[PDB]
Design a protein around this ligand. Structure first.
Ligand SMILES: [Mg+2]
Lengths: 162, 162
């Protein structure tokens, strides 16, 4: 085997994976705050305690993270994964735009827990304010993650295969 | 002659560690993103984010939630070589999370001022007496862990040509 080209093939696919994985983690943070921070507030002993319907700043954060995610996806350049990247970029804008569209419900300090959940809690009973689009975004990125993850393996399996 | 059998598992293993560390790094980036872009903001239908001062309570809840998640991820890291650098990050992670709880009087309510929020989660702010200082050190601890783990992968990949 050609240990020269395969080395740069592993280095390259790995770099791509890392980039994709970063977007994945950024998504995990939105899931974490949706599941743990909605309707909460810092508590000296238990970390988080109840504080209902003032989720505006928390939504703002989610939004900032979504635009950061969009930024990261646009930064991804890869021949092979190109089609799966554009799919993620598309769903990304859809999610970000739904939040903006729901500005009357999410664009204020006193955002209700119910509305917050409909915007960023992908496992909520109702997802009419963005959570639906978040759910699809996850799916899109996970697909891109699968591909990128395998390209790395394929490149690494050339060190022990014809 | 390079032992392509062991070197392959050496690359696969060190790479897994890197990803785990990189995820924590990314989660840290989300706290920086919301600190720099979401404090004192609210969703706006056209400009994405608009001014909405001093209602940073839910946003801080999110930050807290992300910090505990980070602690959770670091505790999951197991690696002989990086052990010491991991325990350093774990330590700083608790310090940060505990400073937030300690400042519950200022950060534990819906009406958290932009000034106080910046002192808790904006590592580049002039004053860092409510958590920012500790967040800065945490970043440093993780970046150090990132360096090491990033090189161990390089060293394992450079065995294919040395
Ligand atoms: Mg006010």
């Amino acid at each position: 085997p050609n240990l020269t080209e395969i080395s740069k093939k592993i280095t390259d696919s790995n770099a791509v994976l890392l980039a994709v994985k970063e977007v994945e983690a950024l998504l995990s943070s939105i899931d974490e705050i949706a599941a743990k921070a909605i309707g909460k507030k810092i508590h000296q002993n238990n970390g988080l305690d109840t504080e209902n319907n003032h989720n505006g700043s928390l939504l703002a954060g989610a939004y900032a993270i979504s635009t950061l995610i969009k930024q990261k996806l646009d930064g991804l350049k890869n021949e092979g994964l190109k089609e799966k990247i554009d799919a993620a970029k598309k769903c990304s804008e859809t999610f970000t735009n739904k939040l903006k569209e729901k500005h009357t419900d999410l664009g204020k300090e006193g955002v209700t827990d119910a509305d917050a959940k409909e915007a960023i809690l992908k496992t909520n009973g109702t997802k009419t304010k963005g959570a639906e689009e978040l759910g699809k975004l996850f799916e899109s990125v996970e697909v891109l993650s699968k591909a990128a993850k395998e390209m790395l393996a394929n490149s690494v399996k050339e060190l022990t295969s014809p």
